[PDB]
RNA sequence: CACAGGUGAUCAGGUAGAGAAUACCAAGGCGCUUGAGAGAACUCUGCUGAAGGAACUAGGCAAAAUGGUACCGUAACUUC
RNA sequence: AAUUCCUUGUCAGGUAAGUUCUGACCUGCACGAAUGGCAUAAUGAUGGCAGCGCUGUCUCCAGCAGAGACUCAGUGAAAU
RNA sequence: UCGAUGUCGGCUCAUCUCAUCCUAGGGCUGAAGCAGGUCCUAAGGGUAUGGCUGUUCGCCAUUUAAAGAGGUACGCGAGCUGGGUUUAGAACGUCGUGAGACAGUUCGGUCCCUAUCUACCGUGGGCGUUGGAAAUUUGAGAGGAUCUGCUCCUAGUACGAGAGGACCAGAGUGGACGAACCUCUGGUGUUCGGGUUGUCACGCCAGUGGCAUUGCCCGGUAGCUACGUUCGGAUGGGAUAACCGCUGAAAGCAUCUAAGCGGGAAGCCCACCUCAAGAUUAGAUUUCCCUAAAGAGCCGUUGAAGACUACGACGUUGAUAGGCAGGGUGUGGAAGUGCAGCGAUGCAUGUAGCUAACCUGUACUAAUUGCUCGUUUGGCUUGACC
């Protein structure tokens, strides 16, 4: 059973998937507008959004945190610098999710995770 | 939860240390005894020239367990040790002291020596 | 672990008869006027009169 | 022999003065609008029809809205039937109320439920399977069900055999618990025991047949 | 909080207050004791190894040495058993729950004391 | 077989380390030619487990456990 | 007794309980001296028995993690 | 049956018989009572753990109300094991000149198969149920369950020379089994919080992150879970088994039987719990709708629901999920700074920082009134009413 569980297993070990989504938020933060997998896109919100409320407020350790859970320095600063600013007075729901089909390779259905306000 | 092939310490003077439960009793195929249940038990280990001889097949009763016993409270009481107090081939205390604590589960009256020879009763 | 005796032909046809291809359901986006599935974007990329890029 | 449909919000404890821990269940107990009185003559058989909850318009369907609208009550999130007798018909008609005060305090009350699902389990959980040896030579039978049957006499698995199936997520009635508590301001209804099912389910409580 | 509100309802009334007191501090409890017509309280001494805060289901547990032998408790914070409870000595421990005092004896079962 | 097998010699970086063991890295090279979901029984490989501690079993099979350096100390027997 | 059929021979030890184990007796079905006799320190992934520690072997299984099983998309056997 | 029907024992899982081991009801007794012995009725449930030995068995120890006898390919290896027996090696005793042999012994010695059909355990699709649909349901019938100790009281009474010691009634509390549950006690808790070893890196200090079984270690949220909590096995109805009768003739008597009327068991049928109209005999009730209607489905957000399904909730007329806000819980004193200290380190800012899944709210994000299926009054005969 699973009741009431949260979380994913994505067939991956619990570093590599904290890594991928890692990766998935930095690359999500950096281009804003980011095409994955429908699962993917949907726990990435659990993992990016938190980012953007704690960057809401600029301090040391914010930002210490920040770069503890994503290990980019320039992306750090972009998520205090712009996207915390931009995004101070939105209570949650950072990203939209638009499902964009099936992918070609293996069917695996597809969506766009797009930062809110002009991503 | 005391079952068969259990060691047990001996919480009186009636010579024997160390005793190993071989039957739990009061059932068809009762499994566990808690404090105030009666055992069959073996010495494995007395004290030179005491009452009880090592090898002695007889009757004891459990008084502490680490498992622990719940009270209509919902708190448990556990101990240390698991130990037991040997009794006569009645089913009555061959002790005339008592070492470390019991619990009130003996109240009643074939124990009641026993609670009374107890340093302390939880 | 095998067969004692060949299966038949309308045996065999009577298990694939459940199986079914499924067809996506189509709606028409107002802005672009465009077949797209349904709840997903479409080619073009405008989804319910929305600007994705 | 008339009850009540509640909602199950969850266990908790309550202390007795002499420090006795009592583990309750609470129930939470919205009206019961009588939608419908079965009899004899028109029925054959004597009942009474409840609804409880709440349910909007656009999930209620004409049928039932003019179901719900016959007997003078709001529409709730289903609808439930308890057996009943002349005794127990004496002053319910439709469009009336049924309230925690139906049970009173100290009686035994019989609690049916939908109980949590498993899902598809085997034999170990399901029906008690003894498991077999983890070593000593064992390779693909630590959890199996063994042997099924005897040889070519009978030939076949008898009925009613244990074998794994879907476990839970079905009806299940518990007697004689008691009734600790009784608020019929807060509408909720307090009851001994585990009460089956999750929190949040529908639970129907009656007197107990027993006595 | 994390028990619904008609329950939080229900609970609110069992509570009943209590100094409230840190882990690894020497505690003294009062339990009520029946002999049978007669009515008495006992006092139970120790350290607290672990404590676990729930509203009204919260729990303690103690531990004393009584002949050479620990004996623990997990007492009920809001049970009517306990009459009282005091603090005797306050102490500082670095981690809440004190697993490792079960196994320490003597000179090591000690707790430092909390200025 | 674009096969988890076999195939002789040569070179032998850094930090720990007795070490060519082991761990993480350098130069260099790779992610091993189906993926995406779900997180049922059951199987495989592992982790943890209250109380008891071989009561298992043909049998302590398997697992668990011990594990280094320095010093102290070490029995029967002995071909010393 | 790697040798004993009767046989789980008898006695003693070990266990609460020992067809196995140890010591002894000799009634050796059917030992015996280079197809070597009886012993023997050390050695042995050797056979048997008994202990300490240790534990999911077990009372009695529970939870968790990964690879399958299950669903979707591509490729696509087998014995019979 | 030799173009192959796998042996003994053990484990797991069972099903049936009664020639009944316990419980239940009786007759007789060399039945005073307690305890028994024999036989009759009774198969509803229950009917142990260990030492030895490959054992079935058997002996022994300790229990129990009891540790029943049997059939099922001496049940069960396409469910597991492989200790014995029954290959190939080696050795002892014995037999044979020898190769070799021994229901003599001893050490060692590869157990394959992805399930087509039947059967069984679950779960769906299709159509049918005399128009269609949303719900609630009656029950022909099927399954589950059926166990029992001990203490007290009656009463140290009846009985008995003593010893001992009740039937019938009443109360309590256990053992085994089963269900549900997670409030309490615990386990687990590899997207929680800390401590710490080696190494690499973030330009460096500091602070952090990767790897080393989650690197190791200490705790722990929700969920699941037992060893934890709650509950159940009914003391009721009907007809009976053995047995005991009332009245009563055949047979002036006697006689439980031939007519008639009774008592009587854990057994039979109900009662309890679950399923149940594919009960094609397809039932009943209340509503809704009929020139694509009422509704159902697809799709989307999803759930203590789930393999896929199905089921449950919701889709802007919204709290369905995520996020967010406030709490709760857990860990235990974040970073920065300052002070003390030569330093490790300690102290204050401050129970601080962080906190999965928990509680209550909140449309910020995603759930598009989009499409498909489904109609148009429901045949005929008879009868009552009209």
């Given at each position: 059973m699973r009741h009431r569980k949260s979380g994913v297993?994505?067939?991956?070990?619990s570093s590599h998937r904290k890594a991928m989504f890692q990766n998935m938020t930095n690359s999500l933060f950096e281009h804003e507008l980011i095409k994955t997998t429908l699962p993917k896109a949907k726990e990435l919100r659990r993992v990016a959004e938190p980012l953007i409320t704690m960057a809401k407020e600029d301090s040391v350790a914010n930002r210490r945190l920040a770069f503890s859970r994503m290990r980019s320095k320039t992306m750090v600063g972009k998520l205090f610098g712009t996207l915390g600013p931009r995004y101070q007075?939105?209570?949650?729901?950072?990203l939209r999710i638009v499902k964009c089909g099936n992918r070609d390779g293996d069917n695996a259905p597809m969506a766009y995770v797009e930062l809110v306000d002009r991503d | 939860m005391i079952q068969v092939e259990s060691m047990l310490e001996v919480?009186?003077?009636?010579?024997?240390r160390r005793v190993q439960c071989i039957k739990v009793l009061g059932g068809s195929h009762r499994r566990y005894a808690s404090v105030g249940d009666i055992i069959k038990v073996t010495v494995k280990e007395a004290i030179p020239r005491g009452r009880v001889k090592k090898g002695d097949v007889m009757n004891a009763v459990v008084?502490?367990?680490?498992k622990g016993v719940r009270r209509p409270d919902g708190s448990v009481l556990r101990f240390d040790d698991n130990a037991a107090v040997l009794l006569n081939q009645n089913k009555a205390p061959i002790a005339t002291r008592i070492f470390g604590p019991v619990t009130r589960?003996?109240?009643?009256?074939?124990?009641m020596k026993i609670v009374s020879l107890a340093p302390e009763v939880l | 672990a095998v067969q004692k005796s060949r299966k038949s032909r309308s045996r065999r046809d009577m298990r694939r008869s459940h199986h079914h291809m499924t067809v996506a359901e189509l709606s028409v986006d107002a802005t672009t006027g465009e077949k797209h599935r349904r709840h997903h974007m479409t080619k073009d990329g405008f989804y319910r009169g929305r600007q994705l890029f | 022999a008339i009850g009540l449909v509640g909602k199950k919000c969850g266990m908790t404890r309550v202390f007795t003065e002499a420090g006795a821990s009592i583990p309750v269940t609470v129930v939470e107990i919205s009206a019961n609008r009588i939608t419908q009185v079965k009899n004899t003559d028109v029925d054959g058989y004597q009942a009474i029809q409840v609804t409880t909850g709440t349910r909007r318009d656009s999930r209620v369907t004409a049928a039932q809205k003019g179901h719900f609208a016959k007997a003078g009550v709001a529409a709730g999130r289903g609808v439930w039937e308890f057996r009943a007798n002349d005794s127990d018909l004496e002053?319910?008609?439709?469009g009336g109320e049924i309230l925690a005060d139906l049970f009173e305090q100290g009686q035994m009350v019989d609690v049916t439920g939908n109980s949590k699902g498993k899902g598809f389990q085997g034999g170990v959980k399901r029906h008690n399977f003894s498991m077999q040896?983890?070593?000593?030579?064992?390779?693909?039978?630590?959890?199996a069900i063994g042997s099924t049957g005897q040889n070519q006499s009978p030939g076949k698995v008898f009925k009613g055999k244990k074998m794994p199936g879907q476990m839970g997520n079905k009806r299940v009635t518990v007697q004689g618990l008691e009734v600790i508590s009784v608020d019929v301001e807060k509408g909720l209804l307090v009851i001994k025991?585990?009460?089956?099912?999750?929190?949040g389910g529908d639970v129907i409580v009656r007197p107990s047949v027993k006595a | 909080s994390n028990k619904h509100l008609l329950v939080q309802a229900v609970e609110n009334a069992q509570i009943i207050e209590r100094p409230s007191f840190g882990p690894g501090d020497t505690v003294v409890v009062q339990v009520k004791v029946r002999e049978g017509e007669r009515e008495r309280l006992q006092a139970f001494e120790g350290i607290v190894i672990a404590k676990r805060n729930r509203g009204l289901n919260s729990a303690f547990t103690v531990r004393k040495i009584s002949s050479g032998v620990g004996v623990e408790r997990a007492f009920?914070?809001?049970?009517?058993?306990?009459?009282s409870i005091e603090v005797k000595r306050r102490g500082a421990v670095?981690?809440?729950?004190?697993?490792?005092l079960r196994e320490?004896?003597?000179?090591?079962a000690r707790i430092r004391e909390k200025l």
């Amino acid at each position: 059973m699973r009741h009431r569980k949260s979380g994913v297993k994505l067939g991956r070990t619990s570093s590599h998937r904290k890594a991928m989504f890692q990766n998935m938020t930095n690359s999500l933060f950096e281009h804003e507008l980011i095409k994955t997998t429908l699962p993917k896109a949907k726990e990435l919100r659990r993992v990016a959004e938190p980012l953007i409320t704690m960057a809401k407020e600029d301090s040391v350790a914010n930002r210490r945190l920040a770069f503890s859970r994503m290990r980019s320095k320039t992306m750090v600063g972009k998520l205090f610098g712009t996207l915390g600013p931009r995004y101070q007075n939105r209570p949650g729901g950072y990203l939209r999710i638009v499902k964009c089909g099936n992918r070609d390779g293996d069917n695996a259905p597809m969506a766009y995770v797009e930062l809110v306000d002009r991503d | 939860m005391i079952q068969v092939e259990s060691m047990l310490e001996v919480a009186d003077n009636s010579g024997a240390r160390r005793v190993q439960c071989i039957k739990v009793l009061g059932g068809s195929h009762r499994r566990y005894a808690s404090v105030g249940d009666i055992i069959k038990v073996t010495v494995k280990e007395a004290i030179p020239r005491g009452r009880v001889k090592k090898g002695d097949v007889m009757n004891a009763v459990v008084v502490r367990t680490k498992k622990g016993v719940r009270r209509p409270d919902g708190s448990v009481l556990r101990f240390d040790d698991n130990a037991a107090v040997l009794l006569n081939q009645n089913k009555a205390p061959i002790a005339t002291r008592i070492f470390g604590p019991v619990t009130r589960e003996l109240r009643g009256d074939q124990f009641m020596k026993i609670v009374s020879l107890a340093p302390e009763v939880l | 672990a095998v067969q004692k005796s060949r299966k038949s032909r309308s045996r065999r046809d009577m298990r694939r008869s459940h199986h079914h291809m499924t067809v996506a359901e189509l709606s028409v986006d107002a802005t672009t006027g465009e077949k797209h599935r349904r709840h997903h974007m479409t080619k073009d990329g405008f989804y319910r009169g929305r600007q994705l890029f | 022999a008339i009850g009540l449909v509640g909602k199950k919000c969850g266990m908790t404890r309550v202390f007795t003065e002499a420090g006795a821990s009592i583990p309750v269940t609470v129930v939470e107990i919205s009206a019961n609008r009588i939608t419908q009185v079965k009899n004899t003559d028109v029925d054959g058989y004597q009942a009474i029809q409840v609804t409880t909850g709440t349910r909007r318009d656009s999930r209620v369907t004409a049928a039932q809205k003019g179901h719900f609208a016959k007997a003078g009550v709001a529409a709730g999130r289903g609808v439930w039937e308890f057996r009943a007798n002349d005794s127990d018909l004496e002053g319910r008609e439709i469009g009336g109320e049924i309230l925690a005060d139906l049970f009173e305090q100290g009686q035994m009350v019989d609690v049916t439920g939908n109980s949590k699902g498993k899902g598809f389990q085997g034999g170990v959980k399901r029906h008690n399977f003894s498991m077999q040896d983890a070593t000593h030579g064992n390779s693909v039978s630590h959890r199996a069900i063994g042997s099924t049957g005897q040889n070519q006499s009978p030939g076949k698995v008898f009925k009613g055999k244990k074998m794994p199936g879907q476990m839970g997520n079905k009806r299940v009635t518990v007697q004689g618990l008691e009734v600790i508590s009784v608020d019929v301001e807060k509408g909720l209804l307090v009851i001994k025991g585990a009460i089956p099912g999750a929190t949040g389910g529908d639970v129907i409580v009656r007197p107990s047949v027993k006595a | 909080s994390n028990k619904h509100l008609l329950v939080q309802a229900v609970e609110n009334a069992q509570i009943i207050e209590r100094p409230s007191f840190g882990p690894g501090d020497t505690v003294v409890v009062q339990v009520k004791v029946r002999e049978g017509e007669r009515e008495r309280l006992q006092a139970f001494e120790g350290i607290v190894i672990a404590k676990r805060n729930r509203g009204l289901n919260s729990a303690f547990t103690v531990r004393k040495i009584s002949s050479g032998v620990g004996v623990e408790r997990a007492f009920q914070l809001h049970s009517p058993i306990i009459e009282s409870i005091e603090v005797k000595r306050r102490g500082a421990v670095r981690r809440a729950k004190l697993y490792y005092l079960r196994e320490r004896s003597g000179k090591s079962a000690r707790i430092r004391e909390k200025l």
